[PDB]
């Protein structure tokens, strides 16, 4: 008896008129359906280069380099003519009819595998399948062709990186996690740090510079990806009005709610509009979301009488707050039109009017299925979203944690809206469909903890937003084939944890303790800090919060008895002590390293006193001790 001979098959690069008729052909998600089998194989090896046109130059080189990376072998792009062993890229504006604005074909034969989009982000999204293909340990593809295109045009999530902050490494991670999906969407709730006089006070953390807000959107839009920025109003405004009482709404006794717009002042309004232009200088979208939802949320419009009589005087006798609230949004789509802009709003702000009619030209993302509902929206002819409680995840809220599984298994689509109404998923108004990520009490889980959750839910609504088919039997065989494509370059790249567990000596925290620190790692890529003198951990633990995080500008640190941060969002009872305890320590352009607090997402620094923000003009930490700060006032 001999052994088995078990060796590597070693194929030559380039086609091959052989091979197995049953070789796999790699998953990828979207799926790409209707694949037409052809003669023979493809493999890329040594030699193999991404050829191009000079106009598609950057998304040859950009592959090359990726694919050098995933498969060890040294792949260049070139220019000129394509070979066999070549991955050929081609831009054919003429087939728009086949392959539409983001849609592409893939041919792998005897001419190599070319790619072939009727646009730059069509073959951008080609290539997004080529190097899904290509990362999976098998680098023979079955020859054949196959053209692909999605069956809706917006195709996404909401992000609402609100109140607290979602950090712009990770805001990054996920524009490349979504490009490698072919996910073209994503509603940014968030807050551009305000800077001119009428507007400055509310500079309160978590905000996002304009440099910030720049370059994601930068990176966005060389991914396909059209970033809608939202403030939500009028209703859901604290973060904005917590400094400017005058213009908060008050009840029929008189007391303020910071969460409400008083929408009949006429400065407040000029006040939301000043915001939207702030926000004009640095999304490129040619839409804004203005909200509108929960308005009402603990009250009733019975409390606001002032708003019945602003109604009567602005929209006539027998005006209700109903048409108040509606007018405020028919005001603000003028007032964005007339800026090229499409309004969105949540189906919520969809309330039953009688002086006035909401303007049928504003795009409605349907989340709440209790109102109005799906099928009469459709026979009123209005442009929709598929924004279901389905497809929403929480920090805190366990009731919306996404089940890939059973909307996989159960026959769920676009079409089918909040609480399991269906439409027709061919209305020629259905614009597509989105997961929604939301932070509520934002202790619970890191953002870290919140990039592992999302995963499945993510591909599956890149599957069904896209390709519209269940072509795996179950989700649990989708799953198999998902973790197997994994996440896209960007992602496996990422320095989580740049230091090495160990001992550390750290001088910006002498002012708690000389040390030196013990730093250990967790499973969400961030740091336990122990001192070593007093044997207690460092944490970001006590200042003024909002969703239950420490948002103060300014807040200092402080020694706790140290918590376990190897475990997982399971364990809700410890959530806050553990959370307080972790840390993100980041490298330098290039080599010096800065400390954040893992849910904060400011930057620990020693305060000068210089610093300019409006927390501080009520509360300074100690000058020459360490506190937290954003990353703009510590840029020093
Ligand atoms: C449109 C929407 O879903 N509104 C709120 C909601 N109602 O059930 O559910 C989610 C999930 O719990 C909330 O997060 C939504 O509210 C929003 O909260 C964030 C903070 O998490 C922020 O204030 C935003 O304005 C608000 O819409």
Redesign the pocket.
């Known amino acids: 008896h001999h052994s088995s001979g078990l060796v590597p098959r070693g194929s030559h690069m380039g086609y091959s008129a052989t091979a197995p008729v049953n070789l796999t052909r790699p998953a990828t998600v979207p799926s790409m359906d209707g694949w037409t089998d052809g003669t023979g194989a493809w493999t890329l090896g040594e030699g193999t280069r991404v050829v191009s046109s000079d106009a598609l130059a950057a998304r040859a080189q950009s592959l090359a380099s990726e694919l050098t990376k995933f498969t060890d072998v040294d792949i260049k792009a070139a220019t000129g003519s394509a070979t066999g062993k070549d991955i050929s890229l081609t831009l054919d504006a003429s087939k728009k009819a086949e392959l539409g604005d983001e849609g592409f074909k893939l041919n792998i034969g005897s001419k190599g595998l070319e790619v072939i989009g009727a646009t730059d982000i069509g073959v951008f999204y080609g290539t997004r399948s080529v190097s899904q293909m290509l990362r999976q340990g098998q680098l023979t593809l079955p020859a054949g062709t196959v053209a692909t295109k999605p069956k809706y045009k917006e195709r996404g999530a909401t992000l609402?990186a609100?109140?607290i902050n979602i950090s712009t490494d990770w805001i990054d991670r996920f524009l490349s996690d979504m490009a490698d999906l072919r996910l073209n969407y994503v509603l940014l709730?968030m807050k551009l740090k305000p800077e001119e006089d009428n507007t400055k006070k509310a500079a309160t953390w978590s905000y996002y510079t304009r440099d910030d807000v720049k370059k994601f959107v930068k990176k966005a839009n060389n991914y396909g990806i059209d970033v809608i920025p939202e403030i939500?109003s009028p209703?859901?405004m604290?973060?904005w009005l917590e400094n400017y009482p005058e213009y908060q709404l008050a009840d029929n006794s008189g007391r303020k709610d910071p969460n409400k717009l008083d929408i009949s002042n006429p400065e407040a309004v000029k006040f939301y509009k000043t915001l939207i232009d702030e926000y004009d200088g640095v999304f490129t979208t040619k839409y804004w979301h203005m909200?509108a939802?929960?308005y009402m949320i603990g009250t009733s419009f019975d409390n606001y009488s002032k708003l019945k009589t602003f109604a009567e005087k602005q929209y006539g006798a027998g005006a209700t707050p109903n048409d108040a609230f509606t007018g405020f949004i028919n005001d603000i789509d003028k007032y964005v039109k007339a800026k090229g802009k499409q309004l969105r709003i949540?189906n919520?702000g969809i309330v039953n009017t009688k002086n006035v009619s909401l303007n049928k030209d504003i795009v409605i993302e349907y989340?709440?299925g209790a109102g109005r509902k799906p099928q009469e929206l459709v026979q009123d002819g209005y442009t929709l979203m598929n924004?279901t409680?389905a497809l929403?995840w929480?920090r805190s809220?366990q009731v919306?944690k996404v089940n890939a599984a059973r909307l996989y298994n159960n026959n769920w689509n676009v079409g089918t809206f909040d609480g399991g109404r269906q439409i027709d998923k061919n209305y020629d108004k259905l614009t597509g469909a989105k997961v929604?990520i939301?932070?509520?009490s934002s202790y619970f889980q890191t953002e870290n903890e919140v990039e592992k959750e999302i995963f499945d839910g993510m591909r599956f609504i890149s599957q069904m937003t896209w390709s519209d088919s269940r072509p795996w039997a179950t989700w649990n065989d989708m799953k198999a084939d998902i973790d197997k494509i994994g996440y896209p370059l960007d992602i496996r790249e990422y320095d989580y944890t740049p230091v090495d567990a160990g001992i550390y000596d750290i001088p910006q925290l002498k002012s708690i303790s000389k040390g030196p620190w013990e730093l250990i790692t967790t499973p969400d890529g961030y740091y336990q800090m122990k001192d070593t003198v007093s044997g207690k951990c460092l944490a970001l633990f006590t200042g003024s919060k909002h969703?239950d995080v420490v948002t103060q500008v300014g807040a200092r640190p402080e020694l706790r008895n140290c918590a376990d941060v190897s475990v997982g969002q399971d364990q809700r009872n410890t959530a806050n002590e553990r959370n307080t305890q972790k840390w993100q320590i980041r490298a330098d352009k290039d080599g010096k390293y800065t400390i954040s607090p893992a849910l904060t997402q400011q930057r620990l620094a020693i305060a000068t006193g210089n610093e300019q923000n409006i927390d501080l003009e009520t509360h300074r930490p100690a000058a020459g001790t360490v506190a937290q700060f954003p990353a703009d006032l510590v840029s020093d």
Do not use: F, K, T
Request: proline content about 4%.
């Open positions: 609402c609100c109140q709730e939500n209703g859901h604290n973060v909200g939802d929960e949540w919520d989340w709440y924004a409680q929403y929480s809220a919306y929604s939301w932070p509520d969703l």
